[PDB]
Amino acid sequence: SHGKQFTLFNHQVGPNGWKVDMLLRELGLSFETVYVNLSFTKYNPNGRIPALIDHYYNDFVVWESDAILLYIVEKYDPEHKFSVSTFDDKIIMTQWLFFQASGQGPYFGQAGWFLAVAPPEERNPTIAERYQKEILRVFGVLESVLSQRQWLVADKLTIADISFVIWNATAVNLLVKGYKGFDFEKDFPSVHRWHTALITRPAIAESLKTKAEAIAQMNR
Amino acid sequence: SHGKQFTLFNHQVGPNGWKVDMLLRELGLSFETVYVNLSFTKYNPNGRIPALIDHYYNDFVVWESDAILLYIVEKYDPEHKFSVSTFDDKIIMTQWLFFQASGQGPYFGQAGWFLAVAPPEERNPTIAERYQKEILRVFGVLESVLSQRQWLVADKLTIADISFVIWNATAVNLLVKGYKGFDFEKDFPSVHRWHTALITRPAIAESLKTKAEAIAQMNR
Ligand SMILES: N[C@@H](CCC(=O)N[C@@H](CSSC[C@H](NC(=O)CC[C@H](N)C(=O)O)C(=O)NCC(=O)O)C(=O)NCC(=O)O)C(=O)O
Ligand SMILES: N[C@@H](CCC(=O)N[C@@H](CSSC[C@H](NC(=O)CC[C@H](N)C(=O)O)C(=O)NCC(=O)O)C(=O)NCC(=O)O)C(=O)O
Ligand SMILES: O=[N+]([O-])c1cccc([N+](=O)[O-])c1
Ligand SMILES: O=[N+]([O-])c1cccc([N+](=O)[O-])c1
């Protein structure tokens, strides 16, 4: 047929590529997904997914999931459906993306490593508890903010909010499920409100459905 | 006298605020440093340093060290001495900042936690080795790139390069010093070249000197 605009190098299990999948569906953009078995370093020297190739921009490549989000909205969100136009809003949107990238992803991922996805002999629930506690602390930070604002930035849905979704879903369903009586809605009602709003959006729900189906299809 | 432009909430031991200290000195900007004992959540809901108050911009506040770097150069680097002007360069500069924020800081910090700065009973050199190995992997990523480019972006010094300095110095002097025969110049000569270029810059050297002096003055 005709070449789609984007290649998203993604992974069925790993959360981070699905931030980008969510945004591409939200904006209605055309992309193929390549699930990478975890070249590729030719597209990202760090050797990690996601990476994005923009075939309609001379095969421009961007890696780091949150940098990909910014690229997409800076080039392909002219009506600012999921982004912002003023300088002040832009820098605060970037602030919250860096909090996601440095404060959620890595620490949620260490909980996942020691609880769930390391080789079984290397899993360690005692060490994992350090990062389960960090998950709850991050939830507490989000709670203190979202108790008094609808969205993170400019009172509108942006990629700042979207960037938190996939790891938050992983945390609630897996990483802190059953941890010391954790109850998402009771313990962090504002985060629950915000998260539930996000995952019930058609495009985001479609992304989560696609991820589940993709896991079901990957053998094993 | 007269109020300085910026307040940098910093810490003597913690690396991350010193990225911002480096940039402010490089640009010759006026700032006071407040060393926070580790309000403050009034300036950052995450409750972490650094945070920046811009008194000449109606006390605008930005937190997350790499978001602070972007704020400073986007508003106060009109000649692009440590930043870039084209879209393509801007997005790749942001890409490398997100790699620093998500791939260096957090994993280097976990090595520091389990090796060096956790309460002594909670330190664990076996667990630390997971993150010492991640330090070397990050060095290997930087090596593969810096063997064929002088600086990370646009063949010029930017905040992308500066953002890596403080954690790299901590890693070489502490976190992987003596780890399995680690020798910075022999094992990662390109990273060593780049890092040495950075720390010998007067403003960056001044920042590192100030940090050492600040540790020497903080009692204990
Ligand atoms: N900051 C990067 C992180 C990208 C990333 O982590 N990609 C994973 C797939 S998501 S899977 C989640 C991922 N876990 C892992 O990657 C587990 C393997 C790893 N080497 C380890 O030892 O921890 C993690 O914890 N991420 C922390 C974060 O989100 O910031 C990958 O490619 N792994 C290949 C490999 O490791 O060899 C981004 O957002 O793009
Ligand atoms: N991404 C943020 C990280 C900022 C940050 O980590 N600030 C530290 C001082 S630098 S000191 C380095 C810091 N270690 C710590 O903060 C140790 C305490 C922590 N609660 C823990 O249990 O790990 C770390 O590992 N950082 C990972 C990274 O750079 O991304 C802080 O305020 N700590 C107060 C507290 O923890 O209560 C940024 O760059 O601004
Ligand atoms: O990558 N992880 O660290 C991780 C951990 C726990 C769960 C899942 N998950 O459900 O896809 C992923
Ligand atoms: O904060 N840390 O994780 C850390 C670790 C190891 C060393 C230093 N240091 O030297 O300032 C800091």
Side-chain angles (χ1 to χ4, degrees):
Chain A
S1 54
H2 298 94
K4 300 184 172 182
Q5 177 165 10
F6 299 106
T7 302
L8 175 62
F9 297 96
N10 204 358
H11 190 256
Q12 297 87 338
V13 183
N16 285 304
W18 293 99
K19 306 180 195 166
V20 181
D21 182 280
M22 287 172 187
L23 180 60
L24 294 171
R25 295 181 197 278
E26 282 283 20
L27 282 172
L29 298 170
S30 70
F31 64 105
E32 65 161 352
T33 303
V34 175
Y35 295 115
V36 173
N37 177 307
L38 303 179
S39 45
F40 196 65
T41 195
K42 87 192 279 209
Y43 300 112
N44 177 359
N46 193 32
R48 303 292 190 264
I49 70 92
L52 188 80
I53 309 176
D54 187 347
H55 301 304
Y56 300 177
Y57 194 47
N58 197 36
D59 293 340
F60 200 78
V61 182
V62 184
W63 44 275
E64 284 299 322
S65 55
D66 287 357
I68 297 171
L69 297 181
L70 281 161
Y71 173 84
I72 293 169
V73 296
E74 287 178 0
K75 200 147 178 51
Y76 301 112
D77 188 17
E79 290 180 350
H80 300 100
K81 302 177 187 261
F82 309 95
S83 63
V84 296
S85 52
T86 71
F87 171 78
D88 293 0
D89 291 345
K90 280 178 180 170
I91 187 62
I92 299 304
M93 190 177 73
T94 294
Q95 176 193 267
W96 282 101
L97 289 168
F98 273 105
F99 179 49
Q100 188 289 314
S102 70
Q104 184 197 48
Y107 292 87
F108 285 45
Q110 298 324 285
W113 179 256
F114 288 109
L115 281 179
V117 304
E121 286 291 79
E122 294 180 337
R123 300 181 194 166
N124 188 320
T126 300
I127 296 303
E129 185 167 3
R130 161 174 169 75
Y131 301 101
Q132 289 173 300
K133 288 182 179 177
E134 184 64 14
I135 289 170
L136 299 185
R137 193 198 71 79
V138 169
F139 287 171
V141 175
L142 293 171
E143 180 73 24
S144 71
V145 173
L146 293 169
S147 57
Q148 300 178 355
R149 66 179 80 165
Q150 186 179 186
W151 308 103
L152 288 183
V153 184
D155 290 335
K156 62 186 284 185
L157 172 65
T158 70
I159 52 164
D161 312 278
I162 296 172
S163 74
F164 285 92
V165 171
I166 189 63
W167 275 114
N168 277 346
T170 305
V172 167
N173 292 327
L174 237 289
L175 308 182
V176 295
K177 186 177 198 69
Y179 175 75
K180 291 190 154 90
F182 172 81
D183 185 307
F184 192 23
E185 179 166 6
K186 296 189 183 179
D187 298 345
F188 305 95
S190 312
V191 184
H192 178 268
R193 180 205 75 238
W194 169 74
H195 184 70
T196 300
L198 288 159
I199 64 178
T200 59
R201 295 187 49 85
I204 296 182
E206 182 177 297
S207 180
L208 296 168
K209 179 182 91 179
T210 305
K211 183 178 190 298
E213 296 173 350
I215 292 169
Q217 297 180 3
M218 76 183 295
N219 224 61
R220 301 218 244 57
Chain B
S1 54
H2 298 94
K4 300 184 172 182
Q5 177 165 10
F6 299 106
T7 302
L8 175 62
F9 297 96
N10 204 358
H11 190 256
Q12 297 87 338
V13 183
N16 285 304
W18 293 99
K19 306 180 195 166
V20 181
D21 182 281
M22 287 172 187
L23 180 60
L24 294 171
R25 295 181 197 278
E26 282 283 20
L27 282 172
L29 298 170
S30 70
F31 64 105
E32 65 161 352
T33 303
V34 175
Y35 295 115
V36 173
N37 177 307
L38 303 179
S39 45
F40 196 65
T41 195
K42 87 192 279 209
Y43 300 112
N44 177 359
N46 193 32
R48 303 292 190 264
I49 70 92
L52 188 80
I53 309 176
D54 187 347
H55 301 304
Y56 300 177
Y57 194 47
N58 197 36
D59 293 340
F60 200 78
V61 181
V62 184
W63 44 275
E64 284 299 322
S65 55
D66 287 357
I68 297 171
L69 297 181
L70 281 161
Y71 173 84
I72 293 169
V73 296
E74 287 178 0
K75 200 147 178 51
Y76 301 112
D77 188 17
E79 290 180 350
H80 300 100
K81 302 177 187 261
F82 309 95
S83 63
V84 296
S85 52
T86 71
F87 171 78
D88 293 0
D89 291 345
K90 280 178 180 170
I91 187 62
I92 299 304
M93 190 177 73
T94 294
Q95 176 193 267
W96 282 101
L97 289 168
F98 273 105
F99 179 49
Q100 188 289 314
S102 70
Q104 184 197 48
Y107 292 87
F108 285 45
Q110 298 324 285
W113 179 256
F114 288 109
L115 281 179
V117 304
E121 286 291 79
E122 294 180 337
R123 300 181 194 166
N124 188 320
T126 300
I127 296 303
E129 185 167 3
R130 161 174 169 75
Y131 301 101
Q132 289 173 300
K133 288 182 179 177
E134 184 64 14
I135 289 170
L136 299 185
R137 193 198 71 79
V138 169
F139 287 171
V141 175
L142 293 171
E143 180 73 24
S144 71
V145 173
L146 293 169
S147 57
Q148 300 178 355
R149 66 179 80 165
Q150 186 179 186
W151 308 103
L152 288 183
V153 184
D155 290 335
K156 62 186 284 185
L157 172 65
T158 70
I159 52 164
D161 312 278
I162 296 172
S163 74
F164 285 92
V165 171
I166 189 63
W167 275 114
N168 277 346
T170 305
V172 167
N173 292 327
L174 237 289
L175 308 182
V176 295
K177 186 177 198 69
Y179 175 75
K180 291 190 154 90
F182 172 81
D183 185 307
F184 192 23
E185 179 166 6
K186 296 189 183 179
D187 298 345
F188 305 95
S190 312
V191 184
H192 178 268
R193 180 205 75 238
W194 169 74
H195 184 70
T196 300
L198 288 159
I199 64 178
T200 59
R201 295 187 49 85
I204 296 182
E206 182 177 297
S207 180
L208 296 168
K209 179 182 91 179
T210 305
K211 183 178 190 298
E213 296 173 350
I215 292 169
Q217 297 180 3
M218 76 183 295
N219 224 61
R220 301 218 244 57

